[PDB]
Amino acid sequence: MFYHISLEHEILLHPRYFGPNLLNTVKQKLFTEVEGTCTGKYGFVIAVTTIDNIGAGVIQPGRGFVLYPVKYKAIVFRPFKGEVVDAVVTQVNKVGLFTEIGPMSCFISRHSIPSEMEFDPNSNPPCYKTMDEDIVIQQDDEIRLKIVGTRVDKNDIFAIGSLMDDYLGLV
Amino acid sequence: QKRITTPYMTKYERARVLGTRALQIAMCAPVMVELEGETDPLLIAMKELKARKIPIIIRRYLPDGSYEDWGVDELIISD
């Protein structure tokens, strides 16, 4: 889910960037540290809108690196537990559907998929189709799923979804 | 403003300001004053203090929790 937040990040600036208008270097540095990363607590930081203010630069003793506490406005993608959201299928395997909820990738287990669905390896491309053939989930298909739980791994958020709940599928 | 601390600069502040500046100078930091062949980083920072050009601002934390921003140039050094 997308939100508007005001976060705090301590920027480490080398003394080499102590030239004229050093605040510009701090401002542009913030567009690389917190931009494009994925904090485990607030989720993926997809983009930064604007900068609120830049705090006083405190010089760390011994290290010699000036620390600049800067406040900025950014939009994060935090998948809340037990939240239903649309997803895009990227690949399909016998284990289960592999979905893509925006920046992150969510995996759907075979058990979570309704029993009526049955994986078909012969059909090109693979797609979880039930016997009645009423609903089929191909690749790059807009499907709605509920995230039962989310886990944070290697500075990234991995989500597990399910379609057992009512009205979860192609619609 | 309304600063109550002594105008002079303490020896401890002078040592840390020069030490931190000297470390910064050794890290390819710019030098405000003109360079006349002084290789040793401490000498570069020492003359910077004499000319009152060090950008470092001393934030003296009072025991009551308040802080005062005293500039190195504003403070009266002893030479």
Binding site: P20 | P30, K53, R60
Partner: peptide
């Protein structure tokens, strides 16, 4: 242990200065 004061960097005083190299 020498922690009653903290050194802060100022951008205004950094506007002047030339790199040694």
């Amino acid at each position: 242990g020498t922690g009653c004061f903290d050194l802060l960097l100022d951008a205004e005083k950094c506007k002047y200065g030339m790199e040694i190299p």
